[PDB]
Ligand binder design. Structure first.
Ligand SMILES: [Fe+2]
Length: 186
């Protein structure tokens, strides 16, 4: 029984119930994420920006079944083209807008990675990706508005690949947390 999360804390409680088992019902998780109405006071603690690039701020470690984190995107900040390491990845906008660009897995031949589609993720919308859907890049293309997103990855992963758009070549990146539980972790 999926009820509307009343608050971020309530959402987290619900997520622990939805991830109690071994499998993930993606549509239900996505629906619950979407139904949480972003309330900036509830996540201000986690929304720690860096001037030069987006930051990843751990909110909840789940049952070890998932990482829940908040990403803070300054104007013009964006990600690499990346995969998600055999995990589910949900992305819900808490503030602002992000452009998500989808790419196919490259062939072995060095070739330009051509976008296969793009879309604009708007406040409160929840997107979903996994390796079977493809790779993506996420960008805050705004010149005037920071964006903040809530990401849930299951299982948790701390490495992924970045892909060079000119060639499809990939390199392994270790992801770091800017903060954990509201505490800056330099
Ligand atoms: Fe991603």
């Amino acid at each position: 029984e999926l009820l509307k999360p009343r608050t971020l804390a309530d959402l987290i409680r619900i997520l622990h119930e939805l991830f109690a088992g071994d499998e993930v019902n993606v549509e239900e998780v996505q629906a619950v994420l979407e139904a949480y109405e972003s309330n900036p006071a509830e996540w201000a603690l986690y929304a720690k920006f860096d001037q030069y690039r987006y930051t990843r701020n751990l909110v909840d470690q789940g049952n070890g079944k998932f990482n829940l984190m908040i990403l803070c995107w300054g104007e013009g900040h964006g990600s690499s083209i990346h995969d998600h390491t055999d995990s589910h990845c949900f992305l819900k906008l808490l503030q602002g807008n992000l452009k998500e660009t989808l790419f196919d897995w490259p062939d072995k031949k060095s070739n330009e990675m051509i976008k296969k589609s793009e879309r604009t993720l708007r406040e409160n919308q929840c997107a979903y990706i996994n390796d079977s859907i493809g790779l993506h890049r996420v960008e805050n293309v705004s010149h005037t508005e920071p964006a903040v997103s809530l990401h849930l990855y299951s299982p948790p992963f701390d490495t992924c690949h970045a892909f060079d758009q000119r060639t499809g070549h990939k390199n392994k990146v270790t992801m770091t947390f800017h903060s954990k539980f509201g505490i800056r972790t330099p």
